[PDB]
Amino acid sequence: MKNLKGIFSALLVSFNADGSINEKGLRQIVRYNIDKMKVDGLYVGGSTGENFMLSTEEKKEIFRIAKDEAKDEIALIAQVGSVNLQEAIELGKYATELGYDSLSAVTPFYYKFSFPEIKHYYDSIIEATGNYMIVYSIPFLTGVNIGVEQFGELYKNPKVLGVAFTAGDFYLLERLKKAYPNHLIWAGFDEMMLPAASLGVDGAIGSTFNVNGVRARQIFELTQAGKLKEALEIQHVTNDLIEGILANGLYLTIKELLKLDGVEAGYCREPMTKELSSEKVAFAKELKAKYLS
Template identity: 25%
Template structure:
């Protein structure tokens, strides 16, 4: 580890900055993890798109379809390929707490910079505050690595700002990916923004959050490599302008991406998010690959529609 638990917050504040993308995992024709394809994508994201960090083995990456050993290998590939040129945060999320801890220890040992830990499914629990605090504290007590909370309606609930603020006091809680309505993450940012980094995956709100909330971190989803190509890095461009305080120019560039956002919304089947993302990647020249069950593959008709929308969205490739 590059730091100890008591230094985790300071380390993250200094190093967890800019655009971090959640990686889709390319599976080959036999549905094995295509390691070379993943490495190729990582090199493109870092070297050509200037993405500053990667979120590995999350829901975008279909971790739920992967074995424990595959998830560990996923961590190792990312750490090896990023090689200090980009940050690495890995999802150790699992409903089995022992499995999550085993993954967290592996992440720490293999050189990941941080872990992200999804709030657990808490069936029948009505008063969640103490349960959630003790859950995250158990990981903090065992680990030095910085931990990002992750709250999303997938858990069956969302963590309340007050619950998150209490957990944020733990020494190696460094961030939260807070997938909630904007008023909730604004409230939390104002409560704990001086202690941990608050972020959400909504790209179209990213610029506003830099300007209004002083955010330094986009954590994270697939837009950084679906909205951009080596010849068209508008998300990076408006981000850098915003960080420099040039908000009017940043908004012009941000707004110029609206045709791309709308094309993605029109073309993406509601039941096939990963398959869509991978096919869009392939149109951009990245490695896409197959999805694993229970996720569904695209039909030929869906691929045709996606190709048509891609062709007129205005992205330069």
């Protein structure tokens, strides 16, 4: 398998005003991430891709386009999970047929699934697809917390590579590295990249890398090299940008910052707010002038 370490943008998708995928803009976002953000890979179909608001056919179309555009130039991870295991299997087979390097799956949500249910969900997608699997943990959205011993159970399936860790529990993080030193962790919070990197995460997956992937890689590499003073300066500027993005509307503002570099990054999909008001456009432009010029 391709090396799955380093910087992965969580791929945003270009939507038309009616909510349909804009293929031309999606291809532009892919190309911008490869050529300009110089990412190691793309995480496709995650929360950033507005995935959970889309139909099965739409998720396939995104997987097909992203893989057609990226070809073999970078690593590609397909997030196929949802509350629907039969959909996760179907998407998982599809992305596997398309040559995606690993699958990833959000812990099933909404219903209060027991841990054995959650494990069986992972084991079923793996068995049905035969592909690698990255557990996607995002407690602040799912309300699901997985402990060290529970991760170990998940890791008994030798196709589980590790965890996309969109959590802030740095004690849990350190304990997962100690217990399962050969399993990978990708840090999911961009605004906490430096401290996650200081504990030896193997890479990161983030929304803001679609526009700030140059700083993200510096923070990651500089931390790993022990150049903490410099990584901290770059985290500080990054977090001024991120604080601004979050204040303005995270997905719409990253898209606006893409548009300001000529990427037809499109609308967001309803029920998210579909377009930035003119005041927030002006705000995004200030962020561009201050941080990305």
